[PDB]
Design a protein around this nucleic acid. Sequence first.
RNA 1: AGCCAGGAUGUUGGCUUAGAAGCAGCCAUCAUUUAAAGAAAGCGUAAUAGCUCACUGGUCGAGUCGGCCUGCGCGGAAGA
RNA 2: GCGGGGUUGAGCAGCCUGGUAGCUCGUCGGGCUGAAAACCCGAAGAUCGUCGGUUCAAAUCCGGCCCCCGCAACCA
Lengths: 38, 141, 131, 136, 131, 360
Amino acid sequence: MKVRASVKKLCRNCKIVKRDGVIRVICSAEPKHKQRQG
Amino acid sequence: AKKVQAYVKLQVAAGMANPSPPVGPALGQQGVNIMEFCKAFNAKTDSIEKGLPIPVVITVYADRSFTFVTKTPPAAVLLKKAAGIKSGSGKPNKDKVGKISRAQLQEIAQTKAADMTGADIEAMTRSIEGTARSMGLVVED
Amino acid sequence: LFRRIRLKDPLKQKQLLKGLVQLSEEGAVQVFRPISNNDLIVGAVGVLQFDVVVARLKSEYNVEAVYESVNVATARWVECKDAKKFEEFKRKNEAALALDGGDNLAYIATSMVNLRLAQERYPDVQFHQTR
Amino acid sequence: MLQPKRTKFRKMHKGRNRGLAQGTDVSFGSFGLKAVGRGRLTARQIEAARRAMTRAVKRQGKIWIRVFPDKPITEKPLAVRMGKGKGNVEYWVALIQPGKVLYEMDGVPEELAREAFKLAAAKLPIKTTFVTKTVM
Amino acid sequence: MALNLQDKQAIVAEVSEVAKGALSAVVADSRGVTVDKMTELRKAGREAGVYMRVVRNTLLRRAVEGTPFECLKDAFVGPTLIAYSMEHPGAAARLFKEFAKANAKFEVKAAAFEGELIPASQIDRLATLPT
Amino acid sequence: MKSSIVAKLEALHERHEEVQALLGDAQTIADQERFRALSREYAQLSDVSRCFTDWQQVQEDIETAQMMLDDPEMREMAQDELREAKEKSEQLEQQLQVLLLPKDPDDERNAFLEVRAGTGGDEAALFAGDLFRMYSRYAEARRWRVEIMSASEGEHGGYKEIIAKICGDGVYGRLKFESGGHRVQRVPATESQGRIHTSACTVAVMPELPDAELPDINPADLRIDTFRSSGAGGQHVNTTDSAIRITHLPTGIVVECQDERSQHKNKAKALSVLGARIHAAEMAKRQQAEASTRRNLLGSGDRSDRNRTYNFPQGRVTDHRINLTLYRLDEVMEGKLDMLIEPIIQEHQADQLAALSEQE
RNA sequence: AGCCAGGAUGUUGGCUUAGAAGCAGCCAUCAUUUAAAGAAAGCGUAAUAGCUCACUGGUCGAGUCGGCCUGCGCGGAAGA
RNA sequence: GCGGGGUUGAGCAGCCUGGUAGCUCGUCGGGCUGAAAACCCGAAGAUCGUCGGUUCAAAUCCGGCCCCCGCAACCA
């Protein structure tokens, strides 16, 4: 999990979802791609 | 239509019987002996012409036996023995290693398009004419 | 699966030599010395045989006996009945050739394939697995 | 790093940055990067942006730079009191007013220009936008 | 797919061959590989060539739009995806049974073998072809 | 020597055969790291071995041709065949020379040639001048530029020690073998009794190493520490830190500065001293390495340390590293070094190939 | 947007490499089967290979896609 | 921060009121000695540290810069 101020999609499988008022990027394919805005 | 089992396509000219450097361990990886690919293949390579690189199937089965067939010879190596020049390009759009005619590539169509798929002879012929273009060899129309 | 004896402590070599020849006299281990360089390489049929030899050596001949320096070798005793051919063989592969106990010349092969190539070349010379 | 070859005077007053800009339209190329904010672009920032957009377009097409850093900005040396004359020149800036087209580019596709200008704008302090050449 | 202009030019050219041709067969190349398509079409290239059209689009209006002008009884081909096989030289030429051989030649589905309805056929293997 | 080089080529041929067999075995590719080097080894060995094998056939052809000449009255045909064989043998040898020409990038680099007098005194100084002229004319012939960086002239003439930089293409490759002692047997000009005196001179050839770069100190690399300064000064000296210690973590060098009252000035001075110390350490390391290399390449100066002997009464040049005696001494003195330099290059490359074959 | 199938070819484009085949990298990036299929977008191999995939067709049958002018919000936001 | 300096290969004069470059050692070519020194004769040499500026003209005058040598960097 990358805690960044700027969260973006990194590949075609990265999906942006807002959980508990926080923007998060979750990737089904690559575990290295998951980030959370913080 | 069966899928690939273990065959690979890489070998130098037929002139060098039993070539150890290009394949290296490629045909020595499986159970097949080194002598097998010389007795089985070079016995057929002397029938018409020698010195041209031609591929063969390197498939292996569970009975230590194997089948082979020869496809059309690759245009890259063919146009060194049929073009005068022996080297290659590197910058095809900025300089030309040599010059070829139109009939020079027309004459290879009848003897090479048998594996190639096309409705017409010209259709397969232009594919061969474009090989030279990719090789940096220019054609004078 | 031959291993060289480094002998970290320069002295005690005569003690080591007396112990090595005695073990060599029995059948537990075989010692080979290359003619080209003054190196001692000790070989045995099995790994635990080496372990037993090292343990016995420490137990009573009491030397440091530093070993396992990297080397690759195979032992083939060479006998040639023909005169003027064996000399050519010796000159061609002097480095590979190593003396063995009982003053027997043995060809040392880096690889099995090297042994096969050596065997195909010079057919008059006979390579014997057993001495 | 752009800087004037000669100058009439070494130092210049701080000044103000009021008013609007003059170079509002894309004059030479086909695409431009226009400033929507206000501030001053230093020479180092201009050089970094030019390198970024050139590398981004792999040295294809042509690129114009409509700004030039000509204002000398001074500052006093470290740990000195407030008097003792004005400081020494350390870098050069170009005053930017809203609407000023900073860079221009043509000879490359539209989306490639978009990406190049974004990468360039990411190294600049002021906020920018992408503009295209307009007839009349 | 491009705009309607390309769609109409393709349709006017597609239905031209059915207007100037003869009887046709059926084929459903869903699982057909490109190699199968490069050997059957190459085989089809020995008589005239690209004359037979494989321009299939079996949506409810994409290809059904051209049938009322000529060969109106082709609207029954609207649900599942199945292709015709045109023959410009010769009424009901020998190429009709090539999907019968292809039925067991790695293509188990052969589009239910109805055949084009020029003699108002149904489910039957039409073997009566003039030579 | 021809016999030695042919012997090495035969051993290389045997090695080439062994590499083809090892490649065939597939155990090496399983290893992977072993196969990669082995494959390169084969690539270099194959062209030279093929050429050598062809040469071997040509030599055998010459033996059979001589035999053919002696008995069946086929002498005319044999004489033509033998003559053609000779032409072929010479062409193959030139090809071998091309195959064994050095491909190293390092060889192309320019070099500094230093010639220093050893035993003999003024005589040796004069020989140093002769050697310098020899090499200079050779450089001029091959379009190189010789710049005399330093010179120390002898009393009776010549140069006691002369250091020059030769800039060209392939300078280091061509001139690396000249380093070591050189012995001159001749009747000295300084001599009045006509006695022959054996004297020696030491030569060092060093390649021009890449230009020194002072890397700017990296802030992350440095570990600044601020602490109170020692001594007089009152409340201000006690409260203000005013002392900076910077330790360069890669090089492990610590610089402490407490001179000025200002931390900024202390830090600036410390940074300057640290930069100077790093530059000095690098410079010293370079000098120590340069000195060690020079020390090894140069001989003791005694007649025993030799790589070439030049006998002037009999006009003979002898190479000691690889056996070769040439009864010339005039063409060689007037440039034309290629005849001597080439066999050494060929033998050295063969030795390098053998070393590569033996690396594990 | 999902589902199912494909995505083959010359040729392994030309180089140089000890191997370079889409992937160490440098230039072209053409042409054929034309309901499309890429001198290939990557993973990946020790190079091939194998997998996802730029694009083509049935299926369910009503909208869908990302830019502009704007109001108000979210994260970026850690101290005794 | 303040005074002084940068001149043939090295050490140094003179930059004078801006038109103009000198000494010693060194260097080159002959001479002496059998030869090398010492000695004798004849020669040569500089964009006066860098860059702008005012003059018809800058080594000289002005301003900025780099290096070298001193002086000071104290009361807390």
